[PDB]
Design a protein around this ligand. Structure first.
Ligand code: 3FE
Ligand code: CL
Length: 259
């Protein structure tokens, strides 16, 4: 199959909705990614056209072709961060730190334009040929700030092991601390190659253990004291006591020179 000048050469994977194909232009040989959706997406395109940052997947544009919408996007030839995390091990701390810096640069950018991603996790964090991180998939994204006025969110969405506890507990909540939380679970996954809990609920034993500071258990025992002190500031149950991005950027481990 093919779309105007582009051939659909192969399946890269599935986003939150629909299929993503590698599109190669037959003329120019340029390779991009195309998300193919059958038959909400006005909002998504609208958010996609806002995006201009080196740690965010770039939107090239779209074509309706009968039933099928085709959303053209930057290709990331390095695959996902998911594939760089070795189970039970993680990755080298300097690599983790570098990816964390890039993730924060992307999140700050989004938040600065009033967008929350709402599903940060390693599958949505892609790597270009130089291992630069790009935040992908704006199908759950939404505006939380417009004309300088913040709106609280109420929709439950995301992925349970990554989702902040207020989203399970509060009728309405601030957007930014939710995305911060999920960045903390990504950090843990990078440093330990395991997720700390199935969900951050009072009924989840591993979540209770963390609240009781049992860091002699896994995954925490695999993580050095400096990044762990950051994770103690991020994975804070009360979102108004949770560290903000400005303060993450002052954290000791964040600023530690590494290999
Ligand atoms: N909407 C959206 C969305 C969600 C997730 C990823 C992509 C995606 C954009 N550029 C890519 N480059 C290389 N692989 C990619 N993926 C696609 C999905 O499977 C993983 C590998 C992408 C887009
Ligand atoms: Cl993992």
């Amino acid at each position: 199959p093919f779309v105007e000048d582009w051939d659909l050469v192969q399946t890269l994977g599935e986003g939150a909705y629909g299929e993503v194909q590698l599109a190669v232009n037959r003329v120019t040989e340029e390779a991009v990614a195309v998300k193919i959706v059958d038959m909400n997406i006005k909002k998504e395109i609208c958010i996609l056209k806002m995006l201009n940052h080196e740690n965010v997947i770039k939107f090239y544009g779209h074509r309706r072709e009968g039933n099928i919408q085709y959303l053209f996007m930057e290709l990331a030839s390095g695959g996902s961060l998911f594939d760089r995390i070795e189970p039970d091990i993680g990755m080298p701390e300097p690599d983790a730190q570098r990816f964390f810096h890039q993730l924060m640069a992307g999140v700050v950018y989004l938040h600065g334009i009033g967008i929350t991603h709402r599903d940060i996790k390693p599958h949505n964090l892609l790597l270009d040929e130089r291992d630069n991180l790009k935040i992908a998939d704006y199908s759950l994204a939404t505006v939380f700030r417009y004309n300088n006025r913040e709106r609280l969110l109420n929709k439950m969405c995301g992925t349970l092991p990554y989702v902040a506890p207020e989203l399970l507990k509060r009728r309405e909540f601030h957007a930014e601390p939710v995305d911060v939380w999920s960045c903390g679970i990504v950090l843990t996954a990078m440093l330990a190659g395991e997720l700390p809990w199935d969900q951050p609920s009072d009924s989840c034993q591993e979540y209770s253990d963390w609240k009781e500071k049992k860091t002699y258990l896994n995954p925490w025992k695999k993580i050095d004291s400096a990044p762990l002190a950051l994770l103690h500031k991020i994975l804070v149950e009360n979102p108004s006591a949770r560290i903000t991005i400005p303060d993450i950027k002052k954290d000791r481990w964040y600023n530690k020179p590494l290999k």
